[PDB]
RNA sequence: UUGUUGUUUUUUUU
């Protein structure tokens, strides 16, 4: 029922492979303060960092369980102020790893606590928030590995696959099978719903931009971006001109863009802002 | 243990999508007398035809069970007529014949074929299908009559490709036997080409204008190993970059292999070269 | 509709 603004990507990079700028599986994507694009390249067991234009800068990590090694890294997040890179690993490892902006290993934790990490983010106080699929848990860490909060949401979540937070201790979780974003507080109380069936079907990720606006991305037919206020009011809706392979994850860039990681081993950058027409 | 000549592809085309020159799943590839590249685009329920340089010419077929395609997975060309032989995988599991213009001619074999996994045509116009799981070879005439039929569960573990010479010898690539197995039309096992160490996990087989046997695999890099029909090794190549899972391969008379891959792209590798100056 | 492999892992839907 919504007439969506058409959009095309202005940037595309990546391909299959093990060399620099190549992926085996780009399961996770994140963006730092300088709009560098950080990608979890799972089956290469490494993290790759690109600039905002998709040029390879550097990589870190290799297959293993030792320090400075990764085993199936799937999601990434950035500590804004320090530029530290938060990495989650999939089961059987299911733990958090922290690397600094130079790709040096800092620490790892949460291995005995996490089961199926599926989304990760960091609030303005540096607390690390992980959402887990299947078991439907949310776990909040500090950067040294202490558990600050923990709660289940198996009552409200069917398939959680993305998470962000505002500065009011509200957690926005995209739910693939509920066709919407679910909002919680740090205590674990369900607050409200953003989007829903018919406008945000099968969401694959969620973002919060510098305006505090909530972006919900999905690939239900074309690639769609639906933008809301935190109270749930729709303010913008976009749709891609071409169809995309399965989408793993999305991240926001300060220029008003979404970085899209897809199963065709490529990343796409869509602009969701435009000039005001005369 | 074999020192392989390194190679790079000189042509690349295709991407994910439903439009012309886009694929959802390029499961099958074939080449006609004019080196047009014919692609089975399975989940789009269509066949797409490109010229030797990867330019889109035209498409035919749409989803359905009427005299339409439902999950076409392999293709072969009747050289003299330019007819396109199409197999559909289960549940349909039948052969369809289209002419060079993409016009439906006829369909057959629905009640006999179970799991078509490879198809080719001999110089007399007989259509040969190899089936995985059940390990069968079935030879049809162009009206749909079964001329020959035999099981090879004793010699085959995972057949995924087939070609023939003009001597009624059938060359079948076996993914889990790491070689090509040779049979006659009666079903007698004749000999083996390749083996463990040089043709691991073959994904297809070809016979070129010289009667030379090409075995393609993606066990690490993309490899081409070339033999005589008696099994003597004469050439061996390997790609400089790694590829996503490869569905199928076909030969171009200019001395190239067309490679269809799970990254929704086709690659053309040249396996001939200039003689260096001595 | 789908048996490639390329270290275990990966509930998107189309």
According to the 3-state scheme, what is the secondary structure of A10-63?
EEEECCECCCCCCECCEEEEEECCCCCEEEEEHHHCEEEEECCCCCEEEEECCE
Indicate the resolution in Å.
Answer: 2.3
Q: Which of B241, B261, B263 has the CB atom closest to A19's CB atom?
A: B241
Give, as one character, the DSSP assignment of residue B44. G
Range of the domain at B270: 1-278
The nearest CA of chain B is from the CA of A111 a distance in Å of 31
H or E, element range at A259: strand A257-262
Q: Residue B263 and residue A264: Cβ atoms within 8 Å? A: yes
Of the candidates B185, B187, B124, B125, the residue with the CA atom closest to the CA atom of residue B156: B187
β-strands A214-218, A203-208 pairing: antiparallel
Cα A167 to Cα A124, A164, A172, A210, A230: the distances in Å are: 6, 10, 12, 11, 12
Are B174 and B157 in contact by the 8 Å Cβ rule? The answer is yes
Cα B230 to Cα B49, B185, B192, B251: the distances in Å are: 34, 18, 9, 20
Handedness of CA A42, A44, A47, A48 (dihedral sign): negative
Nucleotide at minimal C1' distance from the B16 CA? C14
The rounded distance, in Å, linking the Cα atoms of B227 and B180 is: 11
With tokens 């043709």, the residue in question is B199
The rounded distance, in Å, linking the Cα atoms of B222 and A114 is: 38
Q: Which tokens hold the place of A243? A: 């169809």
Are B135 and B172 in contact by the 8 Å Cβ rule? The answer is no
Q: With beta carbons under 8 A apart, name residues in chain A contacting B241.
A: 17, 19, 22
DSSP letters, B138-201, are EEE-TTS-EEEEEE-TTT-S-EEEEEE-SSSEEEEEETTTTEEEEEETT--EEEEE--TTTS-S
**Residue whose CA lies closest to nucleotide C10 C1':** A90
The rounded distance, in Å, linking the Cα atoms of A137 and B267 is: 44
DSSP 3-state of B262: coil
In A 255-274, which Cβ lie closer than 7 Å to strand C?
none
Nucleotide at minimal C1' distance from the A74 CA? C10
Q: Is the C-beta of residue B133 closer than 7 Å to nucleic acid chain C?
A: yes
Q: Is the C-beta of residue A43 closer than 7 Å to nucleic acid chain C?
A: yes
DSSP 3-state of A220: coil
β-strands A37-41, A26-31 pairing: antiparallel
Burial class (CB in 10 A: 0-12, 13-18, 19+), B56: middle
Chosen for mutation from A9, A245, A262 (greatest number of chain B CBs closer than 10 Å) is: A245
DSSP 3-state of B42: helix
Are A9 and A272 in contact by the 8 Å Cβ rule? The answer is no
Cα B10 to Cα A23, A89, B147, B219, B267: the distances in Å are: 21, 37, 41, 21, 8
- Report CA A13 to chain centroid distance, whole Å: 18
Domain count, chain A: 1
Of the candidates A223, A216, A206, A210, the residue with the CA atom closest to the CA atom of residue A255: A210
DSSP letters, A62-102, are -BSSSTT-BSSEEEEEEETTTTEEEEEE-TTT--EEEE-TT
CA of A56 to C1' of C11 (A): 33
In B 202-241, which Cβ lie closer than 7 Å to strand C?
203, 217-221
CA of B66 to C1' of C1 (A): 17
CATH number for the domain including B43?
Answer: 2.120.10.30
Q: Residue B244 and residue A16: Cβ atoms within 8 Å? A: yes
């Amino acid at each position: 029922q919504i007439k969506r603004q058409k959009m095309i990507y202005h940037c595309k990079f990546g391909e299959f492979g093990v060399m620099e700028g190549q992926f085996t599986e780009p399961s996770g994507v994140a963006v730092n303060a300088q709009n560098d694009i950080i990608v979890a390249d799972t089956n290469n067991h490494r993290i790759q960092i690109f600039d905002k234009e998709g040029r390879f800068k550097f990589q870190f990590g290799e297959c293993g369980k030792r320090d400075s090694q990764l085993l199936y890294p799937n999601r990434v997040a950035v500590v804004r102020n320090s530029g530290d890179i938060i990495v989650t690993e999939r089961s059987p490892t299911h733990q958090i790893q922290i690397y600094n902006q130079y790709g040096q290993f800092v620490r790892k934790f949460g291995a005995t606590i996490l089961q199926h990490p599926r989304g990760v983010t960091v609030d303005n106080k540096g607390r690390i928030i992980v959402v887990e699929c299947k078991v439907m848990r949310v776990i909040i860490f500090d950067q040294n590995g202490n558990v600050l909060h923990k709660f289940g949401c198996s009552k409200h979540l069917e398939f959680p696959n993305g998470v962000v937070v505002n500065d009011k201790q509200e957690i926005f979780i995209s739910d693939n099978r509920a066709h919407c974003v679910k909002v919680f507080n740090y205590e674990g109380q369900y607050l409200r719903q953003i989007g829903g069936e018919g406008i945000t079907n099968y969401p694959i990720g969620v973002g919060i931009n510098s305006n505090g606006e909530i972006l919900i991305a999905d690939n239900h037919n074309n690639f769609n971006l639906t933008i809301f206020t935190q109270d749930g009011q729709l303010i913008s809706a976009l749709e891609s001109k071409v169809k995309h392979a399965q989408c793993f994850d999305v991240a926001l860039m300060d220029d008003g863009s979404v970085v899209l990681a897809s199963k065709d081993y490529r990343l796409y950058i869509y602009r969701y802002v435009q000039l005001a027409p005369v």
